[PDB]
Amino acid sequence: ETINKLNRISRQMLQEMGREPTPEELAERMLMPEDKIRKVLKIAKEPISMETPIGDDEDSHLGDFIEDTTLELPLDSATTESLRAATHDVLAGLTAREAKVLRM
Amino acid sequence: IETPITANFREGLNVLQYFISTHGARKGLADTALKTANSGYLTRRLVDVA
Amino acid sequence: GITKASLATESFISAASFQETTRVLTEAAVAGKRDELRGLKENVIVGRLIPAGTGYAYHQDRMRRRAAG
Amino acid sequence: YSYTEKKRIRKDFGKRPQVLDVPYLLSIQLDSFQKFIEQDPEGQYGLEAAFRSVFPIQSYSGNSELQYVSYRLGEPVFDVQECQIRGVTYSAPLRVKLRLVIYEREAPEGTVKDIKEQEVYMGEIPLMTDNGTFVINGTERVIVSQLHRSPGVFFDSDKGKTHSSGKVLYNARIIPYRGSWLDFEFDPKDNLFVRIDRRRKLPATIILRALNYTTEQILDLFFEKVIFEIRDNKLQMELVPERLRGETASFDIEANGKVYVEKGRRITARHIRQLEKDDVKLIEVPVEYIAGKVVAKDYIDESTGELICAANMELSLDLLAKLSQSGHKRIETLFTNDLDHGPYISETLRVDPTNDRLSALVEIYRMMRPGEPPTREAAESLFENLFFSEDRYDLSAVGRMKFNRSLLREEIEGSGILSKDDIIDVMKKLIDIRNGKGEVDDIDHLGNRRIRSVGEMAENQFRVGLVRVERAVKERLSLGDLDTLMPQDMINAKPISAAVKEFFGSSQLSQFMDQNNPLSEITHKRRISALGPGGLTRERAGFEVRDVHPTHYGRVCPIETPEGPNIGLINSLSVYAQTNEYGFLETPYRKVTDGVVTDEIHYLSAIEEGNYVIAQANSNLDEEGHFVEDLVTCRSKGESSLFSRDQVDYMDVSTQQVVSVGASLIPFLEHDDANRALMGANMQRQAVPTLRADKPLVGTGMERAVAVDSGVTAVAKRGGVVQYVDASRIVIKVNEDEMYPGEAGIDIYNLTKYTRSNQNTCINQMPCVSLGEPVERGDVLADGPSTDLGELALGQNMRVAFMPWNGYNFEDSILVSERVVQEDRFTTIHIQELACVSRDTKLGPEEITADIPNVGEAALSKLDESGIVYIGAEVTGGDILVGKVTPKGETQLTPEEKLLRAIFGEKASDVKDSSLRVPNGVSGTVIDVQVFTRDGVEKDKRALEIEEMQLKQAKKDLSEELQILEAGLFSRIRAVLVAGGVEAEKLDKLPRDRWLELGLTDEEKQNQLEQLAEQYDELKHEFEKKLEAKRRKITQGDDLAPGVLKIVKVYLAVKRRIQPGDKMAGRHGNKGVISKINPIEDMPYDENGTPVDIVLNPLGVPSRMNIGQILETHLGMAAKGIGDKINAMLKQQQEVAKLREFIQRAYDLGADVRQKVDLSTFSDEEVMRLAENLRKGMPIATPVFDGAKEAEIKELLKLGDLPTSGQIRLYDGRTGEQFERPVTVGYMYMLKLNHLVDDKMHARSTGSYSLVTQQPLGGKAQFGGQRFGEMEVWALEAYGAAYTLQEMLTVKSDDVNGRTKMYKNIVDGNHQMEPGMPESFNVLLKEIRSLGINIELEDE
Amino acid sequence: VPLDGGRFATSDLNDLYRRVINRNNRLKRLLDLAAPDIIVRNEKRMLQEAVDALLDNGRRGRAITGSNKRPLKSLADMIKGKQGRFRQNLLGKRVDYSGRSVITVGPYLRLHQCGLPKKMALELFKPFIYGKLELRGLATTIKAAKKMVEREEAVVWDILDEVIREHPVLLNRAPTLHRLGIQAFEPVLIEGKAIQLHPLVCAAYNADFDGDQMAVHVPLTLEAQLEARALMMSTNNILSPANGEPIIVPSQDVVLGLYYMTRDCVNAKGEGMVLTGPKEAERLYRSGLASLHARVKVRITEYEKDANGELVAKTSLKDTTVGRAILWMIVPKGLPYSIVNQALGKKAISKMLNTCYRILGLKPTVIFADQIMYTGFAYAARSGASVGIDDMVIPEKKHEIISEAEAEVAEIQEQFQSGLVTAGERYNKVIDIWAAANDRVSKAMMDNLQTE
């Protein structure tokens, strides 16, 4: 209902301002804290079909371009496996009780 | 056409002769570019069958 | 004809590749068809060694071990 | 002769005088849009027309009407430059007056109230640049002209392939500009059928019934009448004597006591003549002849009131009896002949399932919208709404015109809808074609091919916006309260604005201008496309439409078309071509009246040109211009042959008009095979500009036109003397004759300086004029990129030798001397725009601050306190342009990392480094930085520095304006005051500000003083308002996307020179890729000791037949000869006489050319400069097909001191020994296309990966791996290599496990693979199993 | 998964699945509320439609995705894929450890190698480089190794020279047709961004030099190295699999070289003299005393292996030219002098390699071919062959042929004017005379150009 309420104002104010109300303009018109315009206006958007075609009409579709950011680079994982050998080596360099206490 | 190209490339070709050569050119490019696709399709069918 | 002969293939995974996928999958799914691989296309699809060339040694060694003691 | 022509003149071979000179090349683009947005006080196309169409909008019966008054386009929010920098669209607000009237309920019509809402705003429509371009987002964009099937009626064949019985078929098609298609077609049974759009087939007559025609009137329409009389008793007949043609006597034909024809004797022209001259109106026929004859109208029994026979029924000997005894004297029958007049419609009725109008309407409505129950009002509404509604249907003007014309009508203009007469006429014509009289048209003809352009299309999209606003207005006017709402609350902004924005922003015809090159620009702006909306597709249409047609002559260039997926679906516009009044393509011609060739020009369209006989561009006439030979090669109707002396109606205007600006720029084109010429004109558009714009040494004479007409250069608005010349600006003092009385004046040209182009090349203007120089109106003030002194230089000509050099030239390969890379001539300047975005995450806002986790002092050095790189700082790959950091909290580390941090006491930051760094390997100098900020967020340090700087620069510039202007005006006041009251020394003493008080004796000069006063003060305040406006435009926070707080754009200028791997080509379609860059030491040299720049492989010359590239070489050498000689005589400093002599000698050249020449030119100051400009080489113009000849070239070589062969002795720079045989050396113009090798080059080891299916994907512009396809797989399969293939499709790509497990082994020194299963197939399993299909992996 | 600007993007299946859920749940509700039949039926049909749309869309109504006209992609469309019949193995797959670029010549190369841009080889072999850097202990850890090669420290180039040596790379061109479309080469580190490709191989790839690009792939696993070297290697395919004829046949410049080399003019320096052997024949030529082509008798020693696995030798005075004499130095062992004594056209120069292969075996044929290429390029370069505008000779009799043939057409035309011949027969006649004329001019210019 809030979103709709914003739309209503944006309609008159579209030609009334001759350009369009500033992003903070509809904010004063509305009751609440008014910085909420950004959040509400953003979250209100509908997700884009991951099958949305881009370029060439070719089978390249939007979803094909979305990379995995949750993965871990091999150039790193190698250094994890290496760091194991590192700290494991250096933990053989102290007394067994210092080693036990540090590994603990 | 019953009036061939009487000139050649060492000499100049006039407007008409060149305009008439153009069709042969475009049909050449089109035909070859198509025969590439035909060849490919054929190899496809072939490796599929073997 | 070649395009006709390519139609019949024991392996359904192979057929699903170059033929009409939907029909092949259904028509195989009813008979409970069991794909044994044994071919190139299917092995490429499933991502293991090609039953030819360098790989021919492997598959052979596997093919004879199969249906045997 | 002009002023920059005195600087340099191009020696022009060729004979044919130019009767007409090349027009404005940008014509189409500007004219179209000029028509779109404009005020036209009538229905002629424009915003006015599109308004008058959908308007006025009345509600549904409610008598609340909204009409349209007038519209206006407000001044642009930002001008072109600012709009380019900021990134917004160059557009004007559309303000339209609407009038809302409310009629008193239960009228005579009168209004309760009418509110006129002043100019409600709908949308902002984009504006076209003076150069015919649009700026959508900060980017110059061109909308390609479209080529489609012209609206009207069209008759086709479809012989052959259908049914394989031959017999052809005949179909007509009515194609409206808007609305449904109406198709008519025959079938193998000769039954006429009709289909609306592509829909279900219906028997033709079923439409006629819907027009309210009973069967009797259909027969009455399509067939003639055979009259039968029963007079006395037993069967007479009316006979039109022509009816007996093509038929054999079925009985004794006798009348008037004289027997004209016996039984079994076919009736020929003799019998017919006899009957005609003996005038036999009525003859006696047997009762059995009507056994086949079909009755025309209905027949009833007068007494019993019962139907004897229905209309269109076959009579029998018994039926005749039953209608005879009823007292019927007359029987009307159809006139039917299986040869001449066909019995088609009659048999069409027998396949017609319907009876009356309502029946037909039912079968039509159920055809268009099937499955749903039909209604009377529904069928009527639909059928009336299809072709008969002013709303849903238009052929417009072109449509109505072609329609009426093709129907052999008189009226060239008429209603925009269909009439019963129209449909009936079309059917009649189709039947006439099936009957043998008349022919079918063809689609490829350019009379059936219509040309749209930006304006028309934009009009269409705006129209669509207006219909979707119409629905809204009616929807609101449904429930409305009287005086509260007004024409604002209804009409929205977004719908129209998004219609137009969706057009210019994304459309197959809307594309980024290709600006790497003036030729590229100008050849893009003239372009045609049969693709896009309302056009065909590559997949759809075959070779017929792609192919060159005889009608393409002089209209579309035969040799310039793309070579690829779409060939001939584009082409290009010809040189002299123009859009026809109706929108067709017409070409210039010379009218030959009687036996004289008149120089009067005449423009002929595709259909206009058809019947006339047209002469050749190449022909021999003399004196009065009478044809020398008794017969000359000409083309009349669709073909070319020898034609008699005086037959010819017309003649070609130019030797050029067949080709296009691109093809017209190829010298010695006549000597090149069409394929290679095509490729040549195709690649010439790809030439990247060079650092020093050179000039073509070998040329055409079009280059001047291409240079000037394209906006790359800066042309004088008015003539005068240059007051000031700077690398920044140029100020010209206007002559009084060209000058307006008020404001006095000077014309100030602000030059474009180094800035980003669309292709990321450098676009920069340089002044070609010097301080205090005379300039003429229409003269080049400053050259753009790749233009020299008003001509077009797309590259640099150079010394070339044809000979194999150690295989380094092997295929097309090019071998280039080090002298070239050292001279920095083929060097190129690239301008790249890199961006940095500061977004908003739930974790926090991103900072542009210079405080960056994990960077050395060397890293943070090149950045200021604010985090942005300094202007002018040279950077390379990895350098930080803009420091940026985004919050990521709580890293969540592991045990050994925790121990590590414990020992080394490091605080692992809550912030991650997002900073924009120069992409790998690219290196250049920073020429600019821009900072966009959300309106309301505090501008940072650097951005503020920038704002103050820009402010001061603005004030300085505006002040300069006002100063030069004011001085210019007061200098005029000083001059006018001196007439009638001259005081010379007295006037300039007192302060200049106090001058305006002093008057003058009675005269118009007092009123001139008045004028200068008014305009003075006008400028004075205009400065003020302009300054205020500029300041506000600087300070306003630009509106950005959601989530982005601020954006920093850095502009890098990289200078790349030339390296092996770069693509190079001549204008002749000869490609090459530089192989080795060889030392000047190893270069083949001549006896004089002068090395050669490039060594071309001769083997490339014979096979691909382009012989022009050789001629171009030869003449080129010759040209250089004329240069060298002069270079010596200038270095001799002989005197003006010797130089003048030699130059004139050059400019004459032995006989019969059209050039003329000097000594009208000032013998000292002007001549020496010309000689100075010629010393590099002597520029030559070879007209396209009018170009030079071997003899002329050899003669110029005689003047050169150089051999006739064009070949000399060359010595290997290595052994110093000679080369057997002479080798061809000369000067070839060579282009650097931008394929440049450090763009194309890519490599990847282990990069990012796609989420949906785990596969290699570039996310960093760190490129995704190469795609290994099916064919490559087969290639691996032919070899015995299993492991290469497995590793190819498993570990190197698709295996999320195997890839890393591989990497660790690759570093460990163990080469193996533990493959696992590719994730693609593993996903496919889930996809299959997601259905009701169980797919399992068995056994072990 | 989320995007930039806080926007979201998702597969269409959700839109589909969601529907199937909703309606399904609604149906359950309509059961517990005891709805009339007409309602629950409609709900059942709707559920059927939703499920159908989910599984395979387009077999009933073709439902459209939210706010977007384009029909939403269903599971059957997920399986089928597109570009005709391609299942993501079939169309292609992105692959790590690979690259590509514009290609250039590199005639200096042996047939078994290829020029590889330094930077490309650096980025390609990166993991190998990392492992080798800390194998010798030049880098403390893998991280430090990365920092080293990323800094491009001078020491890494030599390590790259190590990891490159015995380690073949696969080269591929765009239109792969037969198996020769991919071939293995030994990498040669080369400054510059272009790939260098041996000329003799340019035939197999159908690769011009006009800007065609080639792709490189690294054979990671040991088995891939040995597969590449023993199968996909350049030297291991010298023959087309289609027919036993050599695909390594010299292309253009080289054959013009050998052609210009062994050929003879009528009179030239050194004509008629005699020399001890090919050595002093070349010595005669380079010093400028004797012409490259002149009729000369020289003593040669040829070989025939015609004994049993054994090379016979025989010496004689052969009547040959200077060029053929010089060229003979290259021809290995058991080949007869008869093979080089001819004019050496593109056809004969192929049968040379062929006979060499069917006689001496693989290795000699390889090295022979290489030598033939080198000498071809060299001597062709020496020859100073070129093309001028006067190199193309038009017959002197052309205009006359044109004129007579032009008389013929006006003759047949005059016959058509008088009705002596029908239109079609006329057409055929005129066309025949013009064709014949063309043949005449062709066989004029052929004689003049050829023997004059």
Ligand SMILES: O/N=C(\Nc1ccccc1)c1cccc(C(F)(F)F)c1
């Ligand atoms: O004599 N024939 C022709 N002469 C001819 C010459 C110039 C322009 C137009 C026609 C001819 C007739 C049809 C089609 C073609 C074309 F397009 F292929 F060049 C050429």
Ligand SMILES: [Mg+2]
């Ligand atoms: Mg090529």
